Amino acid sequence: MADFLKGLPVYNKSNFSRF
Amino acid sequence: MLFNSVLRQPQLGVLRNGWSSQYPLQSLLTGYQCSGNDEHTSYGETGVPVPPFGCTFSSAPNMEHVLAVANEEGFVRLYNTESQSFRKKCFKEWMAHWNAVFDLAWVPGELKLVTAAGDQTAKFWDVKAGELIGTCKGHQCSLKSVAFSKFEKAVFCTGGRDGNIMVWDTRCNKKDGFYRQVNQISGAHNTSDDFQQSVTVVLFQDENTLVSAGAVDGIIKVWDLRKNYTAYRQEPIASKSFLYPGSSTRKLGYSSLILDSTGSTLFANCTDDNIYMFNMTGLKTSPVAIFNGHQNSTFYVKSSLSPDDQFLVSGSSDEAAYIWKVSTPWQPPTVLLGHSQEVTSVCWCPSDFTKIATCSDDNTLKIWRLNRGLEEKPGGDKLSTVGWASQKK
Amino acid sequence: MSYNYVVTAQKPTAVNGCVTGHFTSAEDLNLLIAKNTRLEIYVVTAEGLRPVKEVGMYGKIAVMELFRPKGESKDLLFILTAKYNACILEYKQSGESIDIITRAHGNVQDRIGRPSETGIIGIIDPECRMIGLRLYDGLFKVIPLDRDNKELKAFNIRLEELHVIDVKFLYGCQAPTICFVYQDPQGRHVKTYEVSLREKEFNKGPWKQENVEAEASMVIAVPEPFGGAIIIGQESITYHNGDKYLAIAPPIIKQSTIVCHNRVDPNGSRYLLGDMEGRLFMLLLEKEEQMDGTVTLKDLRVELLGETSIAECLTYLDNGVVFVGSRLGDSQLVKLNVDSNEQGSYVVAMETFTNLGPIVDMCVVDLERQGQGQLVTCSGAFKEGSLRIIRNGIGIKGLWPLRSDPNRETDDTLVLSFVGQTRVLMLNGEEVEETELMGFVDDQQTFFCGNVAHQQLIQITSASVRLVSQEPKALVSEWKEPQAKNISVASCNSSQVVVAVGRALYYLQIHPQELRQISHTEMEHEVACLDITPLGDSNGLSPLCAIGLWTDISARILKLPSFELLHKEMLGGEIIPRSILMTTFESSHYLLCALGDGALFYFGLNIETGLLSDRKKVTLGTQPTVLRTFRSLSTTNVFACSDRPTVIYSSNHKLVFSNVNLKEVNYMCPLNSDGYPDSLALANNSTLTIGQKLHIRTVPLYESPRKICYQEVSQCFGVLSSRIEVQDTSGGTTALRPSASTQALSSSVSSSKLFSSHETSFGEEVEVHNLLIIDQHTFEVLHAHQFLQNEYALSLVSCKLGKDPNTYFIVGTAMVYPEEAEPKQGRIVVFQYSDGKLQTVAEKEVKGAVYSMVEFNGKLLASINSTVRLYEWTTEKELRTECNHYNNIMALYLKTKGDFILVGDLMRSVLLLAYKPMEGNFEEIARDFNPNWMSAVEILDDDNFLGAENAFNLFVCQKDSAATTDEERQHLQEVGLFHLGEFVNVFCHGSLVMQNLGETSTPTQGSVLFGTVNGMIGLVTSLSESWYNLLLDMQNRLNKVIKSVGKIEHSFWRSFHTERKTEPATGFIDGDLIESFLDISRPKMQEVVANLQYDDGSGMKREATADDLIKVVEELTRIH
Ligand SMILES: CC(=O)N1c2ccccc2NC(=O)C12CCCC2
């Protein structure tokens, strides 16, 4: 939960929500 | 290594090794051998043998195996190298010049060649028709080299003892069957500081770029043939110049220039027993590599490159031919022992990595064929070999 | 007779070109993947990766970059081919038609210059001012990016540093700047230059040149907030920006080299790093602000995110999803979780894209023994090795067109049934319930039902008609009960629900407001069908009532009202066809007789009488065949029911017999679910079998396979496999992964005492080679035999030798050592797989590497390095030398046919020998004299010989026969030349289609399948001279008419290419271009063949129409 991996870039929140 | 490269080829596909092949072939050099039937003796008109001088393979289609050999009596002999008829391989021969012949140059892609001689002339020989096309005249001392560009078959350059580089075009009309020059560079290699400020070797990099070397100048010069040097009353200035990279203070000169298939890399034999490898594309005028181990005492010693540009073979006054891997100049060379006198000219077959033709001063032309495996069925033990490849001490 | 037809059956799958950006538009994220000559564009959508457009370059993509010049709304694409054909492409959508256009093109090759060792490097200025290329040593090609440059005119800048490893364009620099790592005798250095377009030269450079680690590999240009560059060599990562210098040496990186990199955050904080071992790392660029204003790097940290497939690409798309582009294995789409799992790894695979990878070896086998071959290939390398099988093809029980929805159709609720019992099943969409109903009876079974109107479903049973339902709630369509018979040989449709019951029969049309009496005459015989075949979507409107008579099946067609037998036409299949049902294709309906045993009959149905049409013959299995027309697409094709059912598909007038992808079924009712028509609720006779030109089955091995051979006697595959093992001073050697060789039912180790002829380090990676015996059904490793230490198995053959009835697995191996350029010891071991064990028979130590082995005439001929040997299998089961041939460098490849032998050399071209039985030794019949650097060979005819160059070329050499008696008979003349563009690895003889009716004057003779390193499979088939000339004219006209995507000349692309010669291609026909004739519009089709003469009926050559040309092209593509 550290800043090592959290906060990865997103274009829009819905690009893979229903893969 | 060779086996590892072959094994990994299917899995990883192709790769770039810095030369025009995908395998390290340094382990096969010891397999070169000259058979008893592969050694030819050049004979003069009187009967005594004469030393061959100048020998290279043709570029004509379906005829890339014939070899043209000249001697000091002016005879030009065409041998068949791939033929195994076990007879006289000299399929053609004719007296090209009354005096000595100092260079031959096959027309690219055609069965026509040019012989530059001591008659102060060059002669255009149509091999298939067995007739003389014409005579290039205008040199006044002695032609020393003749060069054709791989990209054109009508313009060739002749460098002579007078110090002139004479550019002839076969398309231009001949007044009386004698070709007149289309360009001329006078005093190309002159030491500003009897005269004999001769150019030794002239070579083509493009259809407009020419690389020339002198006999005492020590500077390798590059000329743009698009420019007109005939009107230049003053001393011409080369587009590029490679100064002498050595500590020797003598009148150093270069006996041979060789370009690889790409043309970017130039190998120059020097009188101080060195071979300097320069790059003709970059800004580095210093030698990229230095090869040594031979003896380039005379100007007759010449070198050649393998068809894949991997190896460089050079003659010597040591009475042997030295093969260096271009990628590793530091490694000891491979020595092609067997000649009884100075090895004058060498020629790696452009269409065959297996064949190397060495023309020496013991009146012998030797064709070295890569024989892999010394254990075979009976028939011939020692007489069937006259030369052998061994690692240098 | 050397005229060949090369067509790619499977397109390349290995990924080498790779980008992401806004290509299709300025709003949708795109992923562009280039696999050799193929470029595919995907739009990242909510569902996932949506295919958008696939195009074929006329070249091998080496550089692909996405750049947006100022003003342009969407990114343009820069593509450079291996032949230096630079082009700029823009995606242009016309509403429905989808095109990508070439805004600029040009060749950038130079006549002087040695190609660089580190390959082609292509970079774009961050401000899109220029394009930089590193093609040759000592030069840097610069293409100005002005809009005037429609021809891509470039200029070359000469630089002192001849050997350049990698060059990148820096960020945040006013003038364009390149930062590159170069190698000189002093070591490796990093240097910066400023490119001046006005001066066309290199200026000083923003910052100095520093000495970097001796193994620096590639450069990353950090974006504006940080600036500078990152040099990631072996065991070291450095950051350079002016005076700022950061260095780290993480222990994790030193294990294997970093191959690929990608940028996760636009500001450059995070990067993804690939590896040769497949592990995925993340590199962190920690930042810190100096009070206010400029921000500076503080520290460099790398973290091991996890393990992926061996990656040629890392590409972060969005939402924590990374595309991993694999060249040695299947590509992946993985997700970076914020937290790890058991055996901590932050990478979880979401999707796998199949890649055939490097096809090292392959074989064509008929496992089913029906007649259609299958391709089993050795694919992948290292941990990605697999055994892909390529095949060409396409109690709940009941069958009925239950029209629950009068217009929506499909199906919501069904009825389950046992053998003799039935019960309505409550399929409330995706869920079912099993609750008994009091009002129903579950002691009888129903085989066929239907719905007419108002959802009037009626329960059907032998005793009577009873209904307890929810939608119908009434027995309106009352089916009569004359004698209470079961539902057998009866056909009913939606319009009427009629089953064959009793014998006192009148027409059954008991439905509201009509009572038809078509069948009024007394008829004792039980007719299988008493319905009509609709033409299209019509219901209740039969164009004709003629179905023929089952008794005789006369060719002349009789209308039902007339009921008079026409002229007799006896057919070979006197036995009546099992089931005759009319099937209506896209616009074509045909009369097909489904005779199960054989003698199938096809006819065309014309109006009224209908006369007769052409007949066709295709054999089937000894099983009853039922014609089942299925309505699930614009083409309402039919479904066969034989041992190997054929789902025939329609063409202009030639229907193709596509094979089903399952084993076999008897009576199945397909579901028309548009979501997944392939996966349905289909049952079987006793089980529940649920159910794309090519189908690929993957059998992971977790080790690199080398060779494969099939043994039908033992029904097993012998596979040569290699395992990478790390060796430690303690414990001997430990395996990296539980691979296939370790995971075997029974295992054995080789024990040969003849190889008495070294200690490695404590971390040396050794290779352990095994022969795996794999079952052909379960594809599991039945046995695994491990060879000796430092012994590599190169060749494998399964054959019967001499007079021994037993079939042997013969493996040629060589003992390899680190200090030997060439192996000097080898073995030819013989195994017999009797029962679960690989018993050893003979050893036959040899002095060299056995590169390839072929069974010749009951004798084994092997290729020790620089030797071709012949071995006799004596009665004492020991190989004995017979004859030798030495005149070769190395006999890498051996192929034979009859008494002739083809030998491939590492330098020299193919060599043709011939065993002479009388004297008993080889004789060099002929030898090609053009140096070609063989990669694979194949013998096509007794004259033509096929060879593959290592420079992605194909050629055919012909044994001259018209030559006069001389040494000129000893020359193999290279008569056919072609530039395939793929590195062919294996040649094989066979086909993936049905091997029947091949003698009907087929245009192509023979069939050769070649598998390449990029994962593509191709077909080479010989053509006749006239057909070759016609195809060559077609090729020229198509090249004139159609436009390449990069405006690349097809003749330039296909021309034979090598570092020395660039001869144009002759004696070869591009199958892809020929087949592309079917994809051009009809006006464009008429533009082609405008003035072409075709001699179809006879010697006269009429003005060829488009229809004849379509016929020719489709007949050509049938074999593909
Ligand atoms: C080759 C040539 O004809 N010569 C020459 C011409 C022009 C300039 C210098 C020389 N030098 C020479 O030594 C000579 C003059 C006397 C003969 C040899």
Supply the CATH number for residue C1095's domain: 1.10.150.910
Does the CB atom of residue B376 touch ligand 1 within 6 A? no
**Quick check: C679 and C662 in contact, CB under 8 A?**
no
DSSP state of B350: T
Chain C residue with minimum CA distance to A12 = C319
Q: How far does residue B303's CA lie from ligand 1's centre (Å)?
A: 28
Give me the residue label for tokens 């059912």.
C645
Q: Are residues C485 and C455 in the same domain?
A: yes
**Quick check: C1019 and C17 in contact, CB under 8 A?**
no
Q: Are residues C368 and C320 in the same domain?
A: no
DSSP state of C383: G
Distance CA B185, CA C1052 (A): 39
**Quick check: B302 and B293 in contact, CB under 8 A?**
no
Return the structure tokens found at B239.
């587009």
Does the CB atom of residue B120 touch ligand 1 within 6 A? no
What DSSP line would sit under C4-36, residue for residue? EEEEEEE------EEEEES-S-SSS-EEEEEET
Which of B5, B11, B21, B284 has the most C C-beta neighbours within 10 Å, making it the best mutation to test the interface with C?
B11
What is the distance between the terminal CA atoms of chain B, rounded to a whole angstrom? 23
Q: Is the dihedral of CA C1080, C1086, C1088, C1092 positive or negative?
A: positive
Angle at B214 (CA atoms; ends B211, B218), nearest 5 degrees: 100
Q: Are residues C231 and C167 in the same domain?
A: yes
Distance CA C12, CA B339 (A): 54
Three-state secondary structure call for residue C207:
coil
User: Which atom of ligand 1 has the smallest separation from the CA of B140?
Assistant: 3
Q: Are residues C227 and C361 in the same domain?
A: no
Q: Are residues C192 and C89 in the same domain?
A: yes
User: Which atom of ligand 1 has the smallest separation from the CA of B142?
Assistant: 1
Site to probe by mutation for ligand 1, drawn from B195, B198, B199, B200 as the one with most ligand atoms within 8 Å of Cβ, is B195
What letters, b where the CB count within 10 A reaches 16 and e where it falls short, cover C617-630? eeebbebbbbbbbb
Breakpoints of chain C, after residues (C–N > 2.5 Å):
394, 691, 757
Does the CB atom of residue B86 touch ligand 1 within 6 A? no
Whether residue C318 and residue A14 make contact (CB cut-off 8 A), yes or no, is: no
- Pick from B61, B148, B20, B63: which is nearest to C1057 by CA? B20
Distance CA C399, CA C641 (A): 15
**Quick check: C631 and C619 in contact, CB under 8 A?**
no
* φ and ψ at residue C944, rounded to 5 degrees: -75, 140
Per the entry, the structure determination technique was: cryo-EM
Distance CA C393, CA C692 (A): 8
Q: How far does residue B195's CA lie from ligand 1's centre (Å)?
A: 7
**Quick check: C29 and C1039 in contact, CB under 8 A?**
no
Distance CA C857, CA C870 (A): 10
Angle at C973 (CA atoms; ends C969, C975), nearest 5 degrees: 145
In terms of DSSP bridges, do strands B240-242 and B220-224 run parallel, antiparallel, or are they unpaired? antiparallel
Distance CA C173, CA C126 (A): 9
Domains of chain B by residue range: 18-391
- Pick from B11, B83, B264: which is nearest to C381 by CB? B11
Q: Are residues C95 and C150 in the same domain?
A: yes
Distance CA C931, CA B304 (A): 18
Return the CATH number at C778. Answer: 2.130.10.10
Q: State the count of interchain CB pairs (< 8 A) between B and C.
A: 145
- Pick from B85, B71, B77: which is nearest to B37 by CA? B85
Q: Is C265 in the A-facing interface, judged by CB distances under 8 Å?
A: yes
Domain that holds residue C419: 393-693
**Quick check: C135 and C84 in contact, CB under 8 A?**
yes
- Pick from C814, C847, C816, C813: which is nearest to C830 by CA? C813
Q: How far does residue B216's CA lie from ligand 1's centre (Å)?
A: 15
**Quick check: C700 and C683 in contact, CB under 8 A?**
no
Distance CA B215, CA C425 (A): 104
Chain C residue with minimum CA distance to A15 = C46
What letters, b where the CB count within 10 A reaches 16 and e where it falls short, cover C228-250? bbbbbbbebbbbbbeeeebebeb
What letters, b where the CB count within 10 A reaches 16 and e where it falls short, cover C734-770? eeeeebbbbebeebbebeeeebeeeeeeeeeeebbbb
Q: Are residues C518 and C501 in the same domain?
A: yes
Which residues lie closer than 8 Å to C355 by C-beta, 6 or more apart?
C13, C14, C15, C326, C327, C329, C330, C331, C1015
Whether residue C336 and residue A5 make contact (CB cut-off 8 A), yes or no, is: yes
Q: How far does residue B252's CA lie from ligand 1's centre (Å)?
A: 20
Enumerate residues 374 to 393 of chain C having a beta carbon within 8 A of any beta carbon in chain B: 381
For chain A, give the number of residues. 19
Whether residue A16 and residue C321 make contact (CB cut-off 8 A), yes or no, is: yes
DSSP state of C174: S
- Pick from C315, C230, C225: which is nearest to C264 by CA? C315
**Quick check: B6 and C891 in contact, CB under 8 A?**
no
Does the CB atom of residue B141 touch ligand 1 within 6 A? yes
From chain B, the residues in CB contact with C867 under 8 A are 373
Distance CA C904, CA C911 (A): 6
**Residue ID of nearest Cα to ligand 1 atom 18:** B141
Distance CA C127, CA C122 (A): 15
**Quick check: B103 and B144 in contact, CB under 8 A?**
yes
Q: Are residues C688 and C773 in the same domain?
A: no
Does the CB atom of residue B162 touch ligand 1 within 6 A? yes
**Quick check: B110 and B60 in contact, CB under 8 A?**
yes
Residue C232's identity, in one-letter code, is: I
SS (H, E, C) B175-218: CCCEECCCEEEECCCCCCCCCCCCEEEEEECCCCEEEEEECCCC
Which of C184, C824, C907 has the most B C-beta neighbours within 10 Å, making it the best mutation to test the interface with B?
C907
**Quick check: C762 and C744 in contact, CB under 8 A?**
no
Q: Is B370 in the C-facing interface, judged by CB distances under 8 Å?
A: yes
Chains A and C touch, using 3 or more CB pairs below 8 Å: yes
Q: How far does residue C854's CA lie from ligand 1's centre (Å)?
A: 69
Chains A and B touch, using 3 or more CB pairs below 8 Å: no
Q: Are residues C855 and C797 in the same domain?
A: yes
Whether residue A5 and residue C46 make contact (CB cut-off 8 A), yes or no, is: no
Does the CB atom of residue B77 touch ligand 1 within 6 A? no
Site to probe by mutation for ligand 1, drawn from B144, B196, B216 as the one with most ligand atoms within 8 Å of Cβ, is B196
Q: Are residues C686 and C734 in the same domain?
A: no
Which residues are registered as beta bridge partners of C335?
C321, C348
Q: Which CATH class is domain B18-391?
A: mainly beta
The neighbour count for residue C715, using CB atoms within 10 Å, is 12
Q: Looking at the 3D structure of chain C, how many domains does it have?
A: 4
Does the CB atom of residue B384 touch ligand 1 within 6 A? no
Q: Are residues C449 and C488 in the same domain?
A: yes
Resolution (A): 3.0
**Quick check: C326 and C15 in contact, CB under 8 A?**
yes
Three-state secondary structure call for residue C890:
coil
Enumerate residues 1 to 19 of chain A having a beta carbon within 8 A of any beta carbon in chain C: 1, 4-6, 8-19
Classify residue B68 as exposed, middle or buried by CB count within 10 Å of its CB (0-12, 13-18, 19+): buried
Does the CB atom of residue B161 touch ligand 1 within 6 A? yes
**Residue ID of nearest Cα to ligand 1 atom 13:** B194
Q: In which element (H, E) is residue C1107 found?
A: helix C1106-1118
Classify residue C186 as exposed, middle or buried by CB count within 10 Å of its CB (0-12, 13-18, 19+): exposed
- Pick from C656, C787, C647: which is nearest to C722 by CA? C787
Q: How far does residue B246's CA lie from ligand 1's centre (Å)?
A: 29
From chain A, the residues in CB contact with C320 under 8 A are 8
Closest Cα in chain C, distance from residue A19 (Å): 5
Closest Cα in chain C, distance from residue A12 (Å): 8
Q: Is B21 in the C-facing interface, judged by CB distances under 8 Å?
A: yes
* φ and ψ at residue C40, rounded to 5 degrees: -120, 135
Q: Is B291 in the C-facing interface, judged by CB distances under 8 Å?
A: no
Q: In which element (H, E) is residue C1040 found?
A: helix C1025-1041
* Neighbour subunits, C (≥3 Cβ pairs < 8 A): A, B
